[PDB]
Ligand binder design. Structure first.
Ligand SMILES: [Zn+2]
Length: 342
């Protein structure tokens, strides 16, 4: 089932004119048959902002979020662009809410969006915000203002908060889950938990390469596999590491094993996926996932600080993506917008 024919382009062609309200009527027609696209919402929001109807713009944005649509970054950028000319506490709080959206969903502005945010803070009368484009030192100190970036390390309470929350949503076969439970609880904490299956994707001898090289680093390795790997050098893997072979049916064993082992334990697998718990999960993932980067194997660096939109009230630090640099799934941005009040 599709939008009425040509409606997205009709909407896009109306929003700069005095007839822009007609686009919102077309959007209503779309809603009645399908969930509108993020581009549909982008267009109607920009139409509203172009004509200073901030309530309509924000209401459309909230509707979009209600459908669990991920807004285009261009839509978020539009709110800051129009905000430089808007002097109102209520509008400001909405913008700060968009920054919380980026923080909570582990998202980053593109370069021009970062410039729009900078421009908006610097436009707020009386507040004396100054923005600078920076990097972060190895130490975790912003190269602009010298403040220490939020630690990537979860506190014990945070960790047990996350762990407890994860343990209770988990609760495939229960008979097989009990077996794995008894396996883990009768063993010491591991240092790296390896999804042998999902790393055998880039069968046997590269699993061996990951294992045999990690074992030279004096690490306690757990390898998670399925039964079908037992049907040569798998036996070479079984001897170099502790192994659990599940049924060939996706397993929740990697999360359990890693979290049970403790806050020090890291893991290897495919890239992974309330607000506070979600924040902790992103932070934990960033600091604990070991990403393989491609013939002698090397891992992606894990920093001591959390690369995420963040604030201290009197400052913001906002990682952003550069136009000239394409970033992979598992790597964090290296460039930051540093905002501080004088
Ligand atoms: Zn700074």
């Amino acid at each position: 089932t599709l939008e009425p024919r040509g409606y997205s382009l009709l909407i896009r062609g109306l929003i700069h004119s005095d007839r822009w309200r007609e686009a919102l009527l077309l959007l209503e027609d779309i809603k009645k048959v399908i969930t509108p696209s993020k581009k549909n919402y982008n267009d109607c929001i920009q139409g509203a902002l172009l004509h200073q109807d901030v309530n309509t713009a924000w209401n459309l944005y909230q509707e979009l979020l209600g459908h669990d649509i991920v807004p285009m970054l261009e839509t978020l950028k539009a709110f800051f662009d129009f905000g430089k000319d808007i002097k109102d506490d209520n509008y400001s709080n909405k913008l700060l809410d968009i920054l919380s959206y980026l923080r909570n969903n582990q998202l980053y502005p593109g370069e021009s969006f970062a410039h729009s945010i900078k421009t908006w803070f610097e436009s707020v009368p009386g507040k004396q915000w100054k923005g600078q484009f920076t990097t972060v030192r190895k130490s975790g100190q912003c190269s602009g203002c010298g403040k220490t970036i939020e630690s990537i390390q979860l506190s014990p309470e945070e960790y047990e908060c996350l762990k407890g929350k994860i343990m209770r949503d988990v609760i495939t076969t229960p008979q097989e889950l009990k077996r794995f439970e008894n396996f883990i609880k009768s063993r010491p904490p591991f240092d790296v938990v390896i999804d042998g299956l999902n790393v055998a994707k880039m069968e046997s001898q590269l699993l061996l390469n990951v294992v045999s090289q990690l074992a030279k680093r004096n690490l306690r390795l757990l390898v998670l596999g399925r039964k079908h790997m037992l049907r040569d050098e798998m036996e070479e893997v079984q001897k170099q590491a502790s192994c659990f072979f599940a049924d060939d049916i996706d397993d929740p064993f990697l999360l359990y094993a890693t979290l049970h082992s403790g806050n020090h334990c890291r893991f290897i697998t495919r890239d992974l996926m309330d607000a506070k718990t979600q924040r902790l999960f992103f932070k934990w993932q960033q600091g604990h996932q070991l990403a393989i980067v491609n013939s002698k194997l090397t891992f992606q660096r894990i920093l001591s600080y959390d690369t995420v939109v963040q604030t201290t009230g009197d400052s913001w630090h906002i990682p952003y993506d550069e136009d000239l640099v394409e970033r992979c799934s598992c790597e964090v941005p290296t460039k930051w917008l540093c905002l501080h009040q004088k």
